[PDB]
Amino acid sequence: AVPSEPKTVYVICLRENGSTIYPNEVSAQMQDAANSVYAVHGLKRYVNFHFVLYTTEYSCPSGDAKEGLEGFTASLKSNPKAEGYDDQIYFLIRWGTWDNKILGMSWFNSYNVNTASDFEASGMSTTQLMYPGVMAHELGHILGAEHTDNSKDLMYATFTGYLSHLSEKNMDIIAKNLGWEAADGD
């Protein structure tokens, strides 16, 4: 059912070494990401995200996005600041994009409140203001959401600028991975 208290889950957003991030731009990504989840199935009853904005010594070896994320997730496993928090959610953030204007990446279906471990729930996101909702889309993937046929959904495969989950399938998956059950209502 509804838990006795919302679970504290940290979303730890690490500025890539060498990147320059701007405050309003990163704030927009983090608030859009938080709101995209809280808007679903009354999820503030189940989770209160602490978005943490910090830094990392890691930088992607190139513009190769898959290489970049594989290296970022590995870097977390021996990052002394992240010790004891292998069950949280992590984003590497930069100003620009990756090769061919890739906007972000994520490990799909990598966070569940019961099994989270080993820094598996991790991804990367641009923060440029012209790409609202990228972190929210990647967080959706981390929570198990798949691409949708509806082009007005946050989880359309193509960037559209939209910010909200519309797919009932995705909303059920995301909420289930955060402890929700259908009998709980919204």
Epitope: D99, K101, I102, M130, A157, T158, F159
Partner: nanobody, 120 residues
Framework: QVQLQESGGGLVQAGGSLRLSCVAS????????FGWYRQAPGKQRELVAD???????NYADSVRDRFTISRDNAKTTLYLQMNSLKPEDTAVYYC??????????????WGQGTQVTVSS
């Protein structure tokens, strides 16, 4: 997921004007950048003018203040007003749309090209 069709080319004399039009059909909100490219014989294709989904425009230095790009309210039609034309503007002009996948990046869609010939 989008289809582009452009028109308006022709032969004009130096100093003349032409107005190009491009109509997009399909998933219009997938268009991140809507624009015009051109290719002249022996030369590489080059950006002429484009407009972002947020309304920001870019022009090639050589056409700034002679050409104007615009997009209609419905977002399906792109215009290129070409004034004060020069022989250096002779080219096949292509309508273009960039889509961006969150994880996959940019994909290019093209029109068929419309020939522009500027005689002197």
């Amino acid at each position: 997921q989008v289809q582009l069709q452009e028109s308006g080319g022709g032969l004009v004399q130096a100093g003349g004007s032409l107005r190009l039009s491009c109509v997009a059909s399909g998933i219009i909100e997938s268009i991140n950048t809507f624009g015009w490219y051109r290719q002249a014989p022996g030369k590489q294709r080059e950006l002429v003018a484009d407009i972002s989904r947020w309304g920001s425009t870019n022009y090639a230095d050589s056409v700034r203040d002679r050409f104007t790009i615009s997009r209609d309210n419905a977002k399906t039609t792109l215009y290129l007003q070409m004034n004060s034309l020069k022989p250096e503007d002779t080219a096949v002009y292509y309508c273009h749309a960039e889509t961006i996948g969150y994880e996959s990046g940019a994909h290019d869609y093209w029109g068929q090209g419309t020939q522009v010939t500027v005689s002197s």
